[PDB]
Design a protein around this ligand. Structure first.
Ligand SMILES: Nc1ncnc2c1nc(Br)n2[C@@H]1O[C@H](CO)[C@@H](O)[C@H]1O
Ligand SMILES: [Mg+2]
Length: 390
């Protein structure tokens, strides 16, 4: 009669990390990749012999910075002359070239100089997410919902669809990331009446606040605000500067000019930062950090909180701005939703909860997974083809 249909997938195509989910048996499964990771770096690396995508690309970035591409989402659907593009290029080790006022990333690959459009790099990330899903399902996947930031314009949305088409995916729909996070919590399934939802999204490099109104499952974006210069990497930077100073005090040596030592220090700092989200202290143990000196130290959560205190408080400025733009008072917000790994920081949670006078935060769905979760819920709804009974 009719053959069983393959599951459709939900993909959060993120700036730094991507995530894939599938809705089956009345629930969402966030799919881990073959290294056991529930999120995959949005990285693509090129060598004389291979093209590596995800963890394999990110794990070799230190010695191949010119040919390892990341942050393609910051270039997608933008003109080469866009001031955002020109400023971002100063921070990237890879080359960005101008092809008819459209940016392309230029690398050494398989013995040649090759240039790729941002949508081509994103299609490579999407191919890896499709393969992760097919490894779990055990059959080929065709249909997907892909998410984008609410502020993405028509060109940025079309270039994201183009990336999906290059990857061999049928793009069911491009949906906003804050809408997908709300769908993950079933905030569109609460019946008749208006609900005001605030999505608090703190990423690796940027911070976004969105206010949505939901009425009978219909979403309206009421306000967006944020800080392009606020993310998890800024907290890592504060720990880096702290430990560089500590090494100077303790050993009378400045390590800041040995890239390897700084890199090993930053890697340890990011892991210590994660431990501090569940523990009140964390150890830092690096063997032969600089001049054969072992660096064995610790940091309390209180000291880390003091180091990043101004940065954490600054997340409340875009919240107040979004509320003024939406013409709403904080008491009028019905639901608060957390998105991004950096939202696990207890102090960030406490500051926002205190701002909303003790209100509970929706954080039960892993914040680095909530967007893919909602995209998977939507993908299953979009492929339904029920014929009404008499
Ligand atoms: N448990 C956690 N506590 C604090 N931060 C975290 C945690 N987990 C993740 Br993931 N992060 C940070 O989220 C960002 C995602 O791009 C990176 O800066 C990660 O370091
Ligand atoms: Mg995100």
């Amino acid at each position: 009669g009719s053959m069983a249909k393959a599951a459709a997938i939900g993909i959060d195509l993120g700036t730094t990390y991507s995530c894939v989910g599938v809705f089956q048996h009345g629930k969402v499964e966030i799919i881990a990749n073959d290294q056991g990771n529930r999120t995959t770096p949005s990285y693509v690396a090129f060598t004389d012999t291979e093209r590596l995508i995800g963890d394999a690309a990110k794990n070799q970035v230190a010695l191949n910075p010119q040919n390892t591409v990341f942050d393609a989402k910051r270039l997608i659907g933008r003109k080469f002359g866009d001031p955002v593009v020109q400023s971002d290029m100063k921070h990237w080790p890879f080359q960005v070239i101008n092809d008819g006022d459209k940016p392309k990333v230029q690398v050494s690959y398989k013995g040649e100089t090759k240039a790729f459009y941002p949508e081509e790099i994103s299609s490579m990330v999407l191919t890896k997410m499709k393969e992760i899903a097919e490894a779990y399902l055990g059959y080929p996947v065709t249909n997907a919902v892909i998410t984008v930031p609410a502020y993405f314009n028509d060109s940025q949305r079309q270039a994201t669809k183009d990336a999906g088409v290059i990857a061999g995916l049928n793009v069911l729909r491009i949906i906003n990331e804050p809408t997908a996070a709300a769908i993950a919590y079933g905030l569109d399934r609460t019946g008749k009446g208006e609900r005001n939802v605030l999505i608090f999204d703190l990423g690796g490099g940027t911070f976004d606040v969105s206010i949505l109104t939901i009425d009978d499952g219909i979403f309206e974006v009421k306000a967006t605000a944020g800080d392009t210069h606020l993310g998890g990497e800024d907290f890592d930077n504060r720990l880096v500067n702290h430990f560089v100073e500590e090494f100077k005090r303790k050993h009378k040596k400045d390590i800041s000019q040995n890239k390897r030592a700084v890199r090993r220090l930053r890697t340890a700092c990011e892991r210590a930062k994660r431990t501090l989200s569940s523990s009140t202290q964390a150890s830092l143990e690096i063997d032969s950090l600089f001049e054969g000196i072992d660096f064995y130290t610790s940091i309390t959560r209180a000291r880390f909180e003091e180091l990043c205190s101004d940065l954490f408080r600054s997340t409340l400025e875009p919240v107040e701005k979004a509320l003024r733009d939406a013409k709403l008072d904080k008491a009028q917000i019905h639901d608060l939703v957390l998105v991004g790994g950096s939202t696990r920081i207890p102090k960030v949670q406490k500051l926002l909860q205190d701002f909303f006078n003790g209100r509970d935060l929706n954080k039960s769905i892993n914040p680095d997974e909530a967007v893919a979760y909602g995209a998977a819920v939507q993908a299953a709804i979009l492929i339904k083809s029920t014929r009404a009974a008499a």
